[PDB]
Design a binder for this molecule. Structure first.
Ligand SMILES: CCCCCCCCCCC(CCCCCCCCCC)(CO[C@@H]1O[C@H](CO)[C@@H](O[C@H]2O[C@H](CO)[C@@H](O)[C@H](O)[C@H]2O)[C@H](O)[C@H]1O)CO[C@@H]1O[C@H](CO)[C@@H](O[C@H]2O[C@H](CO)[C@@H](O)[C@H](O)[C@H]2O)[C@H](O)[C@H]1O
Ligand SMILES: CCCCCCCCCCC(CCCCCCCCCC)(CO[C@@H]1O[C@H](CO)[C@@H](O[C@H]2O[C@H](CO)[C@@H](O)[C@H](O)[C@H]2O)[C@H](O)[C@H]1O)CO[C@@H]1O[C@H](CO)[C@@H](O[C@H]2O[C@H](CO)[C@@H](O)[C@H](O)[C@H]2O)[C@H](O)[C@H]1O
Ligand SMILES: *[C@@H]1O[C@H](CO)[C@@H](O[C@@H]2O[C@H](CO)[C@@H](O[C@@H]3O[C@H](CO)[C@@H](O)[C@H](O)[C@@H]3O)[C@H](O)[C@H]2NC(C)=O)[C@H](O)[C@H]1NC(C)=O
Ligand SMILES: *[C@@H]1O[C@H](CO)[C@@H](O[C@@H]2O[C@H](CO)[C@@H](O[C@@H]3O[C@H](CO)[C@@H](O)[C@H](O)[C@@H]3O)[C@H](O)[C@H]2NC(C)=O)[C@H](O)[C@H]1NC(C)=O
Ligand SMILES: CC(C)CCC[C@@H](C)[C@H]1CC[C@H]2[C@@H]3CC=C4C[C@@H](OC(=O)CCC(=O)O)CC[C@]4(C)[C@H]3CC[C@]12C
Ligand SMILES: CC(C)CCC[C@@H](C)[C@H]1CC[C@H]2[C@@H]3CC=C4C[C@@H](OC(=O)CCC(=O)O)CC[C@]4(C)[C@H]3CC[C@]12C
Ligand SMILES: C[N+]1(C)CCO[C@@](O)(c2ccc(-c3ccc([C@@]4(O)C[N+](C)(C)CCO4)cc3)cc2)C1
Ligand SMILES: C[N+]1(C)CCO[C@@](O)(c2ccc(-c3ccc([C@@]4(O)C[N+](C)(C)CCO4)cc3)cc2)C1
Ligand SMILES: CCCCCCCCCCCCCCCC
Ligand SMILES: CCCCCCCCCCCCCCCC
Lengths: 515, 515
């Protein structure tokens, strides 16, 4: 059982819990006494540059970002060219810092939905809250499932117990404390994941069993080369994936909660670049470990004859190299690193979802008149209930990954064009917003779901048949949908504004405010 | 001749020159119009945290810090344990940030010597200026010589031409601009050295000729192991070297010019830690390259049979691996990295020396009444003349390295105890300062000079005979001298204060101000 590993894990958990408790103690004079909700939600709009950069780049890298890259590098047929997580995340952060998040700090805003609830109606603000909430919960569930799998592989510990303990730790953090506590925990977690991941590269590379990883990047050894060039017949799919990972990670409440906490705007502008650099630095060891796993031969290690690819467990290729190609005291460090990244991403996501709901649904839509104590108690109970819901989804269900992918898709397709319209273009009244949202949502769900083999419905050129024969798509409908939403929103909003201006349609049926 | 390399070098030089010119253009409204000297010297006391950290950690790493570490790792009999540059620099920065540089920013100060000229007399302020000036010039000369050797090895270019061009570039930077221009150049130079050094590690490691670098760390292959454990009979020397590199890099005008430019004190406090982290990150590839050079066999590479150790050119072990174990387009990148680090350290040192002199010797000691234009012209001519002097010393002399070591020693032994006394303890009048400085200086020069085989004079236990038979020392006299200076300064200052207080010695002979 290696009781030393369990003791180290529990004392590390207690140490980060003590850090969170100290942060909660420190967070007692943030602002005056009648803005407790706003204070706990946005940290009092006062953090340092380094602390913000560290907490944000710890938020983005959360274990799934490591495992997906490692698996994509390792699994034959994907290669390195199909592991678009590093470049996608880095360029998404760079684009966000360049274009967005400067106006967000320019105005006095609390969450992502505040501009939306200000421009459109309260109904529209409550309606756009569903996709982002679903995406954040699904992401947290997937991250928790990945952590459970890693724990179960590393030590003979039940997945349920590990995920329950880690999630309870996350709720005990983000319930007793808010943004301050979560950022102070993420600062330590960043260093934990760095010292864990970057220290296991020389250990694995110098293994006698492993071959020359440079020879396999252009030649074949035990399998197809791990570089993985993309064929010309699938360039559209690669561009679609790049666009999704480039423009679908920017309209996330985790990003906007951290930008709307710096004392100024240039602080957040350079925070984005620091986060991108940290994301690249974190992605490098994952790529290296994936390459090591791809360019090594089993039947000489403690694993045995059947490779991970045949046994269909390549989703956890990282904690398999970290276990069978490194000593025990390096394996425990890497497990701690993965757990710390998972905890950081999970707590950040759950706090962002709670911050979105317990304000933009409760005090601006349902109870416009409520005491600060009531709202803070709603805050504290909402963090717990949403964490419990994410835990139940992660533990009692097995289709979490595909649902998470679909939820991220939906978040991108819905929020990003609407965020672009509300932040950059003028006009963009709710009359066109409803039509754009409906069109994008229905076009995406009719675009085809190939993971859960649910329904292809509308056929697009390419007609790719999977194992079940369900027709898969090739056209970039995942981004055609976003562009369709953008143009239809602009056109319909301007048409409504022009028709109202000319008086051709009677103002009697003006349901919303566009006169 | 590889004209592509020369073209790349000259266009890189022109690019950084354009960056410096743009910085000089930007630095035109720093403060009001009657503080031109103070503005050009301390950057207007307004820089960002990231810019300050980057410029400072680029200042510390300057090519010599790389070559010395690589040579110490490579040369047999030294090993890794005797390469105390990384830990020494990092802990010096950490100690500085913790203890010093908070009071420096607390008071309104311009250079290191301002507290000294304020507490002691103008004569004492002018007297302590000599050692730091000599140390900075000697360091710049050594760095320039190292760059010349690297250029001469990489390309068939005369050393004189390369050092002249690089030094002229440095003067053209720090003459047209001050702290702002030097920091804006160092920011780009940091990224240049990073992308140069850290990109040549996988290229050299994957060489067919090189052996397993992990096997040679505890075993012997072609030579003694490159780890290099320190014998128990030389522990005192190791502790002496560690103390020198730990407490002798803190009282340097390069450090205090960069701390006395941030808008606050916590900015500099965390700037020190950022600099230490950057220094460690820069030191890692140097250690790796030294290990690669130590654990590789010639007679299979383009070099030939005689190893660098036998030919006695191990001082440039880094640009030898970078040349014969990497392709041409990686060798040029590494050469650019080394040149950028050299330029950063040289320009920082020359600007610090000019800032010290042209203020604390000229406007507070000689011409108390002078126009701002006169002082700025003195600034601009002093930068050029000191750069030319450093260039002449680096080019026309061959004993630069040992003189630089002795100058750093002297700077440590003299400044650091006096800085400690003036910054921390009370009393410490000039009456004891004179005695402490004289005692430390004479004790150090009588402690023995083993490099230039000049004079051992006073014998200390150990009686180590070198090739010439000159007795070398073992006792930690290099730190005994500093502790002797500290205690004698404290004791003599307090004795003078007590004697003045009691009236036992008549106040007629009170030369200085201690009544
Ligand atoms: C500046 C930055 C880089 C610095 C380091 C550069 C060099 C890296 C060296 C890597 C290194 C140390 C680990 C990393 C330390 C440094 C971490 C630094 C982190 C921070 C940067 C890898 O050695 C490690 O341990 C095992 C070897 O010991 C090896 O395999 C083992 O464990 C697997 C898992 O449990 C598992 O499959 C199985 O048990 C093994 O297969 C592991 O895969 C490996 O991780 C080198 O160790 C060298 O490897 C030698 C065999 O080549 C090894 O045996 C040699 O000596 C023996 C007598 O001592 C002698 O009897 C042997 O005959 C001789 O061969 C020695 O240990 C050592 O000489
Ligand atoms: C992080 C940013 C930087 C990344 C840089 C990545 C590229 C680095 C260079 C690529 C590289 C490292 C791979 C590293 C993997 C991990 C990378 C990612 C890590 C981070 C995620 C692998 O290159 C592989 O090496 C093979 C040999 O092992 C070689 O030949 C194989 O395929 C052939 C058909 O193509 C086939 O005919 C052949 O039979 C195969 O054997 C191929 O080039 C290739 O397969 C090293 O190769 C570089 O070039 C030379 C060999 O080409 C190598 O030696 C040569 O040049 C010396 C100097 O001039 C000089 O002595 C000699 O001319 C010669 O000895 C260099 O020393 C090395 O530097
Ligand atoms: C992959 O794993 C297989 C496991 O079967 C390795 O097979 C090895 O084959 C050699 C050659 O026959 C065996 O050596 C001799 O085997 C006999 C039994 O037939 C034994 O009595 C002798 O004492 C001697 O060991 C070897 O045992 C066998 N390995 C094992 C574990 O039994 C094979 O080499 C591996 N590598 C590949 C296929 O690349
Ligand atoms: C270190 O360098 C020496 C260079 O002399 C290497 O010596 C090599 O020795 C082999 C074995 O004799 C030579 O192979 C044969 O040499 C004869 C000449 O005696 C030649 O006519 C044959 O065609 C064949 O090449 C080899 O040439 C020779 N190397 C050279 C460059 O001449 C030695 O192997 C190297 N490595 C060590 C000592 O570990
Ligand atoms: C996260 C990714 C998208 C960006 C950061 C990593 C890349 C900059 C690295 C990762 C792996 C590297 C590759 C690994 C191996 C090789 C083979 C190497 O050798 C050959 O192709 C054979 C000919 C030769 O040796 O020159 C050339 C560099 C290349 C393509 C490397 C180019 C740079 C790559 C793509
Ligand atoms: C700049 C320095 C002072 C600090 C940063 C680098 C060190 C943390 C690294 C550099 C080289 C490393 C060493 C390189 C090789 C080895 C051999 C390695 O294997 C053995 O000693 C044999 C037994 C075994 O394999 O466990 C153990 C780790 C060790 C000492 C490493 C320990 C960590 C070291 C000292
Ligand atoms: C080939 N697979 C293994 C199957 C699915 O396609 C993939 O290429 C893929 C595509 C997108 C993702 C993805 C993951 C997370 C997110 C996310 O919502 C998560 N964050 C919010 C954490 C940051 C980025 O946005 C978006 C896209 C993951 C895997 C990976
Ligand atoms: C064994 N050798 C090769 C011979 C001399 O002893 C060494 O260990 C050694 C000792 C100290 C140094 C040293 C170099 C620079 C400095 C410096 O003045 C330079 N900076 C101001 C740049 C930072 C540190 O302080 C101090 C000590 C260099 C080499 C190296
Ligand atoms: C055999 C190959 C050994 C490689 C050792 C160095 C790995 C990269 C540097 C350490 C991690 C940073
Ligand atoms: C054979 C050994 C090959 C090592 C390749 C990886 C080197 C370290 C990672 C790249 C530099 C960062």
């Amino acid at each position: 059982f290696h009781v030393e590993g369990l003791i180290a894990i529990i004392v590390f958990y207690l140490l980060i819990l003590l850090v969170g408790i100290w942060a909660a103690w420190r967070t007692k004079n943030s602002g005056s006494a009648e803005e407790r909700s706003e204070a706990i939600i946005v940290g009092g709009r006062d953090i340092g540059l380094l602390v913000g950069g560290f907490t944000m780049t710890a938020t983005w890298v959360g274990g799934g970002y490591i495992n997906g890259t490692a698996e994509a590098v390792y699994v034959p047929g994907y290669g390195l060219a199909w592991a678009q997580a590093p470049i996608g995340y880095s360029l998404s952060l760079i684009l966000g810092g360049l274009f967005f998040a400067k106006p967000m700090r320019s105005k006095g805003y609390v969450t992502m939905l505040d501009p939306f609830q200000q421009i459109y109606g309260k109904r529209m603000g409550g309606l756009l809250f569903i996709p982002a909430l679903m995406g954040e919960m699904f992401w947290a569930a997937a991250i928790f499932s990945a952590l459970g799998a890693t724990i179960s592989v590393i030590i003979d510990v039940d997945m349920h117990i590990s995920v329950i303990i880690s999630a309870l730790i996350a709720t005990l953090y983000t319930l007793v404390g808010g943004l301050y506590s979560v950022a102070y925990t993420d600062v330590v977690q960043l260093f934990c994941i760095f010292v864990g991941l970057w220290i296991s590269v020389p250990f694995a590379l110098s293994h006698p069993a492993v071959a020359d990883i440079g020879f396999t990047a252009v030649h074949a050894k035990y399998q197809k080369p791990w570089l993985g060039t993309v064929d010309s017949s699938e360039v559209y799919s690669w561009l679609d994936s790049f666009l999704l990972l480039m423009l679908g990670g920017i309209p996330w409440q985790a990003y906007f909660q951290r930008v709307l906490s710096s004392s100024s705007a240039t602080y957040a502008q350079v925070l984005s670049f620091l986060a991108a650099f940290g994301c690249l630095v974190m992605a490098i060891p994952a790529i290296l470990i994936g390459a090591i796993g791809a360019s090594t031969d089993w039947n000489q290690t403690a694993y045995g004859l059947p490779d991970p690819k045949t046994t269909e467990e390549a989703d956890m290729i990282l904690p398999i190299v970290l276990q069978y190609l490194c000593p025990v005291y390096i394996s425990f460090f890497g497990l701690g690193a993965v757990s710390a990244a998972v905890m950081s991403s999970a707590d950040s996501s759950i706090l962002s979802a709670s911050s979105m709901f317990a304000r933009n649904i409760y005090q601006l839509s349902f109870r416009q008149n409520a005491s600060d104590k009531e709202i803070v108690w709603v805050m504290r109970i909402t963090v717990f209930v949403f964490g419990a819901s994410a835990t139940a989804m992660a533990l009692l269900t097995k289709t979490v990954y595909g649902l998470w992918y679909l939820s991220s898709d939906l978040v991108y397709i819905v929020i990003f064009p609407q965020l672009l319209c509300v932040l950059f273009v003028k006009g963009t009244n709710t009359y066109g917003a409803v039509a754009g949202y409906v069109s994008g949502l229905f076009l995406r769900i009719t675009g085809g779901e190939p993971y859960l083999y649910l329904q292809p419905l509308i056929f697009y050129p390419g007609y790719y048949p999977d194992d079940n024969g369900i027709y898969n798509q090739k056209f970039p409908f995942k981004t055609l949908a976003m562009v369709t939403s953008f143009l239809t929103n602009i056109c319909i909003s301007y048409l409504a504004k022009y028709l109202f201006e000319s008086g051709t349609l009677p103002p009697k049926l003006d349901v919303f405010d566009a006169v």
